[PDB]
Design a binder for this molecule. Structure first.
Ligand SMILES: [Mg+2]
Ligand SMILES: [Mg+2]
Ligand SMILES: [Mg+2]
Ligand SMILES: [Mg+2]
Ligand SMILES: [Mg+2]
Ligand SMILES: [Mg+2]
Ligand SMILES: [Mg+2]
Ligand SMILES: [Mg+2]
Ligand SMILES: [Mg+2]
Ligand SMILES: [Mg+2]
Length: 73
RNA sequence: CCAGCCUAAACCGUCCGGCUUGUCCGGGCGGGGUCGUGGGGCCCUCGGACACCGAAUCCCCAGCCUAGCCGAAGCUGUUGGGA
């Protein structure tokens, strides 16, 4: 099973990552310990918006301090 | 004997709660949609309301069921316990 994991995990990967486990690992450890969540299409999508909306949250807090470079220099 | 229909999904509005507040995610209601000459969603351009079609639902009636009622035309002998 593939999960997205909410915490950097040794052999696995870092947070936010989507990785393939053996279900046993997922259903009996990852999932239970809340260290990861099911790669549901219902959640790969809930990652589209976590992804884009902290990317444009700085794909604009840079487009903003760019004027402080237009006239404060 | 005769007859065909409703939906799920995209898509839109909504209300609720979950939260890492996100143009999201999930659940509920509504709309939308229902097909194989493929169909629907969405986006463009066009004539449709007064078009007509129409129930398997509902309303009234007829008819029927559960009691009934009307209904024609004969009398005398005669054997016989009795016609
Ligand atoms: Mg196995
Ligand atoms: Mg969705
Ligand atoms: Mg979506
Ligand atoms: Mg419906
Ligand atoms: Mg949807
Ligand atoms: Mg919606
Ligand atoms: Mg309102
Ligand atoms: Mg409908
Ligand atoms: Mg009108
Ligand atoms: Mg009719």
């Amino acid at each position: 099973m593939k999960v997205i994991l909410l915490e950097p995990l040794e052999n696995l990967g870092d947070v936010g990552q989507v990785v393939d486990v053996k279900p046993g690992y997922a259903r009996n450890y990852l999932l239970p310990r809340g260290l990861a969540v099911l790669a549901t299409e219902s959640n790969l999508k809930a990652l589209e918006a976590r992804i884009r909306a902290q990317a444009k949250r700085l794909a604009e807090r840079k487009a903003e301090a760019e004027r402080l470079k237009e006239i404060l220099e």
